Ligand binder design. Sequence first.
Ligand SMILES: *[C@@H]1O[C@H](CO)[C@@H](O)[C@H](O)[C@H]1NC(C)=O
Lengths: 270, 49
Amino acid sequence: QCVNLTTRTQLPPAYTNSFTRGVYYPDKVFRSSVLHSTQDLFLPFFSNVTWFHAIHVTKRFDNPVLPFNDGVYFASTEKSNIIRGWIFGTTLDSKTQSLLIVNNATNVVIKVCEFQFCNDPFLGVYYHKNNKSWMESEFRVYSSANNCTFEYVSQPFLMDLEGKQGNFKNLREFVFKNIDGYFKIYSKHTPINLVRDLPQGFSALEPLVDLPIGINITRFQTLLALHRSGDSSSGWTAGAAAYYVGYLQPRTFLLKYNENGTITDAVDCA
Amino acid sequence: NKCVNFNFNGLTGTGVLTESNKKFLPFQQFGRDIADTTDAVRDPQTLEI
Ligand SMILES: *[C@@H]1O[C@H](CO)[C@@H](O)[C@H](O)[C@H]1NC(C)=O
């Protein structure tokens, strides 16, 4: 069962500037001390990326249904692991094969299945005052799933889930691409000491997985956790969190490697 | 230390393999010198460069 939450204020959309962000290793070929030109789908330097916020203070619960043109760069400045995963598809209603990648309190699930995704997929954490403890309570994403082919579940772990106070600390940068029937996920991750922005700087993403799914992805959504400790659609908190979305386009970049294999500077030719 | 015809994960070539001081990243298999000519390869079985 799903409930569409209410008590959510409407603001415009917001936007920000991405400074030399969204650079990965185009290929798996180690190069050392070299100035390589490569043409591939990148996030242009000094681009504008869509800003989505999740702040307590409204409760600014952002999880809209965004397009997926040719790839997405997804950055998350988080503190308490509010963003949990993503969903990709065409219709999201089990008519067409969708994908979901979730990181619940225990496991990392990756399913390519015919989910009946509801309008407001999310996960819910419950906080106990009797003994202070946070743990996953609800998992509202999907109704039904009959035909499907690809599943993966990672070795169980124990995850924080607790809501800290302060500024954001963890930057999670992820690159999604769907090409040659391969869903390519590049990721990387960096301690930050900002308050509200998506840092500047350089950091090359390294590939994480290559799922051989071969589906037809045009839209996607993020899915993030809420805090509870009201009714079914009013009794929930957001938790500090922010995430930025960009949209890859075919570009020439001239990368620089170190004396190592790690990409230490790039320039967008256009 | 011998002229050998080698095949490392589809990468076919001819030459002599020797111990190398180069340090590859965990996700990098083979390294190319300038001009994109193969220069080093990590043997997948034991991850030796
Ligand atoms: C870049 O982002 C959006 C794209 O929709 C655009 O409206 C905006 O004016 C552009 N510039 C800045 C500074 O955001």
